[PDB]
Amino acid sequence: SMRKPIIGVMGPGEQATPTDLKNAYQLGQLIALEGWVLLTGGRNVGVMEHASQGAKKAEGLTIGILPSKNTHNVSDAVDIAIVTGLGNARNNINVLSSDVVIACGIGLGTLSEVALALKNQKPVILLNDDLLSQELFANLSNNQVWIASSPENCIELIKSIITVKL
Amino acid sequence: SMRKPIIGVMGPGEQATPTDLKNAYQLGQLIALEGWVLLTGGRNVGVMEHASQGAKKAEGLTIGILPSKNTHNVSDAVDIAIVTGLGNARNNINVLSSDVVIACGIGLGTLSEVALALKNQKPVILLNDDLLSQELFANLSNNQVWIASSPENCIELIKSIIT
Amino acid sequence: SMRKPIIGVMGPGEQATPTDLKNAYQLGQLIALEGWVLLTGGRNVGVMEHASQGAKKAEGLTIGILPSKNTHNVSDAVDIAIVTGLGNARNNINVLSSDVVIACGIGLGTLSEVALALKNQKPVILLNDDLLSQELFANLSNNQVWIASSPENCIELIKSIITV
Amino acid sequence: SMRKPIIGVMGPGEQATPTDLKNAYQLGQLIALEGWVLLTGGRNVGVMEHASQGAKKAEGLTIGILPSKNTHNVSDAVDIAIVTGLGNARNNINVLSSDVVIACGIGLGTLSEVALALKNQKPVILLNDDLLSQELFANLSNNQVWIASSPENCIELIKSIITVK
Ligand SMILES: [Cl-]
Ligand SMILES: [Cl-]
Ligand SMILES: [Cl-]
Ligand SMILES: [Cl-]
Ligand SMILES: [Cl-]
Ligand SMILES: [Cl-]
Ligand SMILES: [Cl-]
Ligand SMILES: [Cl-]
Ligand SMILES: [Cl-]
Ligand SMILES: [Cl-]
């Protein structure tokens, strides 16, 4: 493949913590500064939107995988709107399309995406303060999930992951 | 609606524990005995297979929602094979189609289905031996998830929910 | 497989003509009288509604594959409501799930299902008065599609197909 | 929306004719020269492959919407590989995601996409030499479908559509 790495950033919306939102915005910037593509589920609030705005601040390309049948809710920070009409079934597209999936914070939708990514043997990085989810996913994935300490650490982990792929 | 209640029994496939299989068979029997319809992921392994066999022993109707593009892997105990060709994206159809979701055991696919069902505000009953999953879903659902003690207790809970 | 044959009856919804509705009801009834399961797109309009009503008149089992995320539009004659939340992507589930697909009338959604059925290597029977779609699908399918003259003829064709 | 127009080029894969492939390549180039994004079904065959290669020759961005669960079959000329695992259900994503759908040749998957696009009242342009398909879609769309004469005429039609829609 000559394609740029695609990094999926998943996380909560309205219930994202202040730390999740700061982490998301920083991640978006850092992904774009590497020349990587950012993929999100296209939500116009919370982690996905802060990540997308971060990437755009650093002139990166952003892809949104929308659950709706139209673009009515997509933000200006999404360059490419993939309109699925699949509702929450689109979560599987997010994970299959990503070279690495980062869960920035935790919530029900994020839990579903992490679970699907690990079932598909996709590399997953958790960036959150939820020890229960970390232990549960480590157990179910036979310790294949990665736990990051910061946005910068996520980028370091991605570089090690995509180097082993190569 | 004059339709019969559809109870979705989710749970591990190949990695199901022996207790998950015994619980799944008993759930299938008891669901069928109520005249309810059983929905599973449809394959010839694990909770899907055992629940479907339990329901068939009691002459219940069984629906399988298959992830592949044909019926190669279908349980012999599935009456209606819905072939989706969606892979793991069929998990959402399982949840949306169920009046109640029971998670019998734990694994990655089941975690995805429970999360989706709770996000849809579907009633969800956990029947497992995994205290981490029970505490995590109680927290994320603001204690709306039910934790069952047995297959019989799942049935009792469903009767309270659907009445 | 010990499962009953599943016959997918596709056709227009809101745009169905009175002829399509009569044909649909008769098809549903005959599918059920054969001891087969009827699958439709499940909604309370058009061929879906009338085929389902016909199958229920003969006490057959009916499956509806709904495009929305709830049962609000389901036919009262659907026994099993499979709620997909997929929109028109559910058309692929309709054809993958069917042993034979019947197109009862014509419209854009029905054309998409016929095309997907033929691409997914499923037997298709056309029961309509649309010569252009009949010729086009005969050409694209190297004459594997079947053209029926009546609801009874559809059942005759199914019996020949599911025998081999 | 400040997003670039996304033009979906649909058409036969394995069964594409030499004319379909020439038209597809030229379409891809012309879409990219307008600064538009090309969307295809993403695979390394037929119209998908040749449209993607034409767009890359003109340094355009290409999106591929793949039906399988990995990138095994992806065209080398796809920049963004959307892996769906949906099989032919991805055809709905192709049409929902496109501002205009061009059907470059005819085959069964293409017919499904044309039909779904028209059902959604998405603009559709047919570029083919099949008068049966042109008459059928004109009838079923109440003459809303467009019939193009050449790849260049497709671009002219897209400009007329983007202006009114
Ligand atoms: Cl979430
Ligand atoms: Cl499964
Ligand atoms: Cl399967
Ligand atoms: Cl599981
Ligand atoms: Cl419909
Ligand atoms: Cl519906
Ligand atoms: Cl139709
Ligand atoms: Cl394809
Ligand atoms: Cl593919
Ligand atoms: Cl085609």
Numbering used by the authors:
A (entry chain DDD): 0 to 165
B (entry chain CCC): 0 to 162
C (entry chain AAA): 0 to 163
D (entry chain BBB): 0 to 164
Reproduce text from the manuscript describing this model.
The green alga Chlamydomonas reinhardtii harbors a Moco carrier protein (MCP) that binds and protects Moco but is devoid of enzymatic function. Moco carrier proteins (MCPs) neither belong to the Moco-biosynthesis pathway nor qualify as Mo-enzymes as they are non-enzymatic proteins within molybdenum metabolism. In the present work, we identified and characterized the first confirmed Moco carrier protein originating from a prokaryotic organism, the cyanobacterium R. orientalis. We showed that RoMCP selectively binds Moco and discriminates it from its dinucleotide derivatives.
We chose the MCP homolog from the organism R. orientalis, a cyanobacterium belonging to the genus Rippkaea, a recently established phylogenetic lineage formerly assigned to the genus Cyanothece. This putative MCP, referred to in the following as RoMCP, consists of 163 amino acids corresponding to a molecular weight of 17.1 kDa and shares 52.5% sequence identity with CrMCP. A monomer of the RoMCP construct in the crystal structure comprises 178 amino acids, 15 of which correspond to affinity and cloning tags. The electron density allowed the modeling of all amino acids of RoMCP in an uninterrupted polypeptide chain. In contrast, most amino acids of the affinity and cloning tags show disorder. An RoMCP monomer contains five α-helices (h1, h2, h4, h5 and h6) and one mixed helix (h3) that begins in a 310 conformation and ends in an α conformation. The helices lie below (h1, h2 and h6) and above (h3, h4 and h5) a parallel β-sheet, resulting in a three-layered sandwich structure that resembles a Rossmann fold. In contrast to the canonical, six-stranded Rossmann fold, a seventh strand (denominated β4) expands the β-sheet of RoMCP, resulting in an arrangement with the order β4β3β2β1β5β6β7. A nonregular stretch of amino acids between β1 and h1 contains the Rossmann consensus sequence GxGxxA/G that is usually involved in nucleotide binding. However, CrMCP exhibits a tetrameric quaternary structure with 222 point-group symmetry generated from the content of the asymmetric unit by a twofold crystallographic rotation axis. This tetrameric assembly is identical to the content of the asymmetric unit in the RoMCP structure. PISA estimated the solvation free-energy gain upon the formation of dimer AB to be 90.0 kJ mol−1, which is significantly greater than that for the formation of dimer AC (55.6 kJ mol−1), indicating that the formation of the RoMCP tetramer follows the route via a dimer AB intermediate. We thus reason that the positively charged crevice and the chloride anions bound within it mark the putative Moco-binding site of RoMCP.
